[PDB]
């Protein structure tokens, strides 16, 4: 039951050693100078540790009038890619080593989904419950200030983001505080932080992002005969049956999209209890049940399962919640053949070894829930373009599409003595609804898909190159370390 | 006749009270702290008044050598949307109230056409006719300087624009003066002001912008069966017949585009006289007549009407000139069912109540002449993009289009033993032209059309929502207020 | 009675026309180009009107939770001298015209005392008595912010200052708000405003500044045989007898210092009533009386005089209170020969003419109460020096002094067989107190005295140059206009 930090770090060292060799021979061994290039692995030593970590201690006057000093910290893992990216966590269980760890994860994660951002992470030792909306605000802002004055929040330095503990409300404050203070003259002040309200410069499709990422991440592999054979998957009768642990944002959507495409949800577990039903569970029903009242407990059309759903018999198990939920203990008691990490670090290193032994394909957090980050990239861009995606092309494109059809029509009618006989100028029903309901989220969603696909293939190619089996995790880390390295390498350090 | 500031104010307060109640219940009553969220209407009382207004006296050495002080002002209504936008006036009738008023209009007008700009407006108590080109330049530059040193010109702060009293020449100077002085280090210096020459970073399709706007504005509503029924329009034999008051550069185009689509111009006024002809009047002909010599008076194919063509018997009357031309007096004497405000404030509040009483749909100036602004937004972006729209797509697109058609061809050929029989690969005449002559102005004009439309639906949906009839005006202002509010709300003021 | 604007403007014109002529002839008629140099009096036309004037409307959330919008303005008269200087007034009566006027006064006043600052002046339509300390703060800050973002509050742009309606507490806030936000990177952030607490970067000797100024102003003229003869003053039996109208800060000190040097206070009025006693009145007593309880009414050793002390028979009458207290009505009824304006505009133009008819010397407000400003200059400097005056010289000096004395002693003891006989190494009692209690205030107070004196002689010289009598006012303005002009002239405008 290791702890985040000594989990990630292992993962790195793992896929650091596996790259070192190859990373010298073949890649750069044709201009080998004193074969001391193997001492250039010092670039890997630099990548491992966070380059900067700022600890704070600011005060805020509670609503009752009493003073109080809040402590928090933000760590920036790497700068290989200028603008650092990472969330902000409001919890009373947020250690410097936790942030440092997550921040490390970020860099690699971003690499995997080709996002030009360095890994960061922030944490404020506070418990939102114990503060009033007004207080919270006061905190986020004073935080933003300090964070700014020391180069830890800037649209070209570090762009924060929400976490399970924080929301778009906070982000909106961060943004605004910044813009109305130290970034007053910055024409891209609002790009200092993402995950903010649409009105404040947010990007359409943020919410569903992470969730949709999980889906495409699974999709890409579930549709790869090769892998699906090693597991004896891509059925004919069974088709697809999954389970999701944690009905949060990510979990909910993950079950929405997964279900939409033929998969059947057999079990959903939460902090409270769980749910079971071989027949299937409908996303909207369970969603409206959890929105109408308390939790998911006492949901009709579903027997209350007891304990975690991590042992429910299904094909795909998606851990979209807490940390380290799959350990060396319950690792051999999992039915599922595929584990989709819809969260960070939901499986321990020991558990990984087991799963590998009994052919269990674990889709890396490092890649699966990199959907939010991918879209946050878009939000950043959308603030640099200062325009909502497709604002200037939708109409143009529409016209061009109708000209295309009209050309086929006129050109097919000139193969007959008519002037309105053939009727190609009519788009399909789907294609019509697309055109008529074109909107930013469509450009976003599509860009997401594209990235999750490209990345997927990339991981697969890397797992076939280093002969790995279903160890997609290390593959991904390796993939990442190779990218981060290349940047550093093709420059240096001080003589970079 | 009330003045411009009284009107606009009234309009605001009108919409402001309409919103208030719905703005609390339904749209935020779900987490209603001690229902004091009625006291949040303060937001509205912050939005109403301009938040800044700079008055300034600056000297210039007249050509003859003599010194003279020039006084002018610039008012920034709101900063809810960072870059303020507004035009510069050069008239000896300006008045700190006027600029405050028009700057108030701008904010709302931008909101309507989803343009991320705050409302601003400048004014220099001067009369261009009494100053040499050289002098005028001196002025516009000094003015830019002072305006810059105080934060009232700046690609991120405030982006000025031309008015009927200024031109691209001036704007060019403003842009250059700024980029050669204060904004020397700003990589977006030439985005400090719009409406500039092409060679100075201007955007194609500026001249026809406002005009085209008018058209689309009208078009969107004259295509809506619902509204066209309440009037008894969208006829089968009368089709469309319109009249334009003021043959300026908005009026002229308005006629051109209106006419080009099956509408017949039956009357065209001016500041001199008028024109009449139930058979119709050709735009080109009347244009060439005006351009070839003097005014439109003495135009063949047309009997010299006497008085204002605001009484002519037509379907659509488009006031594209002076201010307050439709008052309580002549309000009842109109024969047109639709009044398209191709100018600002061409109808008084009293007139509006009359037109409503005798079912007369008045398309708001707040929306109908927002075309120019909409495009100015594009110019700004163009300047930030550092590339002419389409530059890197036109060719790519072209290719992709041909491949599309080729596919349909080849594909269809397969259903026949021939390799050249069916020729879909040929684009319609129109489509060809479009492809061959693809320029920036096409992307621009299309983006415009897309904004006018979306905005038109938005206004309609708002009208229906607050069960407003043909009072599109208030409906628009309400629509605006709502937007501007949302921004403020989803943040605050100091604790924003 | 004419308002402040009308007056100050008149004063300017007056001096302006007196300087024009001479300002061309002997000054610069040697290079005389075209003799058009008269047309270079345009300079003057630029100097008269304020160059900028910002009007704002910013919100604050009152303690009760309600939301109000505060309106206020700042006006910068001239920039001829880089940092503008001027106070901030918190009263319901403030009017754009008022600030403009007072700003205008500053520029000239500073010129008189050789202070390198432009003339500025703020104003916030608000009555401090209606707001809680918290609320006041919240206003000063939000005001400082908006005032900064538009270039009306920086250490090198415009340095505000306290008024009778605002104190050091508000300044402190201004300073801090600025240095925490916009000016965060400015190493001289705390030089953005003056009149702030000592612990915030304030200079020692600010409270006795304006008062002491009034004293040295009077002292310099009451010591000039020439002027004192025209009035038959500098007596040998009557010595000195004065009267002060207004027992505010300036008035109190004025009496303290005046009295300390032989004068004899015979009457002191207030907003309530007055006091009279030919025998004399002791500052400390009357001070303690006021402090101890209520006003000055009921004070022992003094018969309650009814009305204004302006008519009390005395030598020097010092109006240290409200505006326009000496008009064309009571002007003839004055018994004093000298009128020391310890306030701004306490005598109307029409009163001035009268006093000049019956040889009454009126020492100009423009000069007399320029003591505060003079010291505020020091405070500014103090903040830019980053060290308290004397900090690194007191000790050194002390030592030097003793060595001086000990050199006289040893040297004198060498003219007599004795090593200890003569004792010149002993300072006087006064000297010793000075040495032992050396502190910043001393350096300040000295510098102030030096300025008031040099400025006094400058005024005189001017008066005698332009052959003005006891019309010290115009003489001062003229003296100012000359200075301001010289700057502009020895440069230009655009081609400056």
From Swiss-Prot, chains A, B, C:
Substrate binds at residues 85, 109, 376. It comes from Bos taurus. The modification N6-acetyllysine is found at residues 22, 28, 48, 100, 109, 121, 125, 129, 149, 264, 284, 290, 301, 303, 324, 328, 337, 353, 395, 415, 418, 441, 465, 483. The modification Phosphotyrosine is found at residues 73, 450. This is Glutamate dehydrogenase 1, mitochondrial. NAD(+) binds at residues 79-81, 114, 190, 382. Belongs to the Glu/Leu/Phe/Val dehydrogenases family. GO terms for cellular component: endoplasmic reticulum; mitochondrial inner membrane; mitochondrion.
